[PDB]
Amino acid sequence: DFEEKMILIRRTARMQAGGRRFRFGALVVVGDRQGRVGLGFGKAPEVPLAVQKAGYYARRNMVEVPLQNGTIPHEIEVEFGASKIVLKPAAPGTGVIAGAVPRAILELAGVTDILTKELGSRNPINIAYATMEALRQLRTKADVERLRKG
RNA sequence: UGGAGAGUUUGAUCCUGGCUCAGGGUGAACGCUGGCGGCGUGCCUAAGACAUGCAAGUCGUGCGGGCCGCGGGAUUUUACUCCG
Ligand SMILES: NC[C@@H]1O[C@H](O[C@H]2[C@@H](O)[C@H](O[C@@H]3[C@@H](O)[C@H](N)C[C@H](N)[C@H]3O[C@H]3O[C@H](CO)[C@@H](O)[C@H](O)[C@H]3N)O[C@@H]2CO)[C@H](N)[C@@H](O)[C@@H]1O
Ligand SMILES: [Mg+2]
Ligand SMILES: [Mg+2]
Ligand SMILES: [Mg+2]
Ligand SMILES: [Mg+2]
Ligand SMILES: [Mg+2]
Ligand SMILES: [Mg+2]
């Protein structure tokens, strides 16, 4: 079992004859702090059920994060829709310098030392999806070598 | 060895997009408050106007004097005059 941080919860609303009718969404990261994180987005008529639903979804949605001493192999920019995330390696003693959303994700993947910047649409959902892709897309000297053989 | 973002357009959503804030800085000023020291710093305006004192002189080993004194001489008549 992993840690489960909740980034964003919000109440949405649909219209119906005589009144508005509310739903709830919840963004949840789950991770072990050792190279596995999962992002999950879950909606439901009550907050509780939505958070729970989200964690579940988050576990069905995990990722290889190739740490290298609390940080990442290289720099990556990822655009997701209009949201862009940059992710930069840092020596130790730096911290995770990042906004609320990518930080929670980087924390639970066991990144300890990383420089970020949100560019673009600063939309939480979309920033989180970009952060995931960004991690998702990390390679290392190892796998790159392996890719380039013949 | 270096990079955090948030609030606000909607019933709700995404995007655009402005506005606003959190940070650092100061020859400061204003309020409330005020114990000590060290080191810095102090007319941003009228390059307005200025009382009063002080702020560039020194050299007699370049030169000749004036003025106020004192001493010694040429003089034993008291006027004149040489030197220091
Ligand atoms: N007298 C007060 C004001 O002086 C002003 O003039 C001032 C300026 O001309 C000059 O002041 C200077 C200033 O220009 C420049 N920025 C340097 C420094 N800041 C000031 O310094 C001046 O005043 C300070 C004390 O205040 C003195 O210690 C300094 O030695 C003197 N030069 O000298 C005057 C003061 O010395 C205005 N004339 C007027 O508003 C009024 O005279
Ligand atoms: Mg784009
Ligand atoms: Mg924008
Ligand atoms: Mg409108
Ligand atoms: Mg509204
Ligand atoms: Mg904005
Ligand atoms: Mg002083």
Strand order of the largest sheet: 1-2-3-4
Q: Tally the structural domains.
A: 2
Helix content: 25-40%
Alpha-carbon distance between the termini? 40 Å
Assembly context of the chains: part of a larger assembly
Give the total of beta strands.
Answer: 8
Question: What is the radius of gyration?
Answer: 17 Å
Q: Could you please say which CATH topology of the largest domain applies here?
A: Ribosomal Protein S5, domain 2
Bulk shape: elongated
Portion in strands: 35-45%
**Backbone structural class:** alpha+beta
| Number of helical regions | 4
Protein name: Small ribosomal subunit protein uS5
GO biological process, one term: translation
Domain S5 DRBM: 2-65
InterPro entries: Ribosomal_Su5_D2-typ_SF, Ribosomal_uS5, Ribosomal_uS5_bac-type, Ribosomal_uS5_C, Ribosomal_uS5_N, Ribosomal_uS5_N_CS, Ribsml_uS5_D2-typ_fold_subgr
Write the layout of secondary structure elements.
Blueprint: E1 5-16, E2 19-31, E3 36-44, H1 47-59, E4 62-64, E5 76-80, E6 83-89, E7 96-97, H2 100-108, E8 114-120, H3 124-136, H4 141-147
The structure holds paromomycin and magnesium ion (6 copies).
It binds one RNA strand of 84 nucleotides through residues 11-15, 20, 22-23, 81-82, 86, 88, 90-91, 93-94, 96-103, 115-118, 121-123, 125-126.
PDB class: ribosome/antibiotic
Keywords: E site, tRNA, Ribosome, Translation, Antibiotic
Entry title: Structure of the Thermus thermophilus 30S ribosomal subunit in complex with de-6-MSA-pactamycin
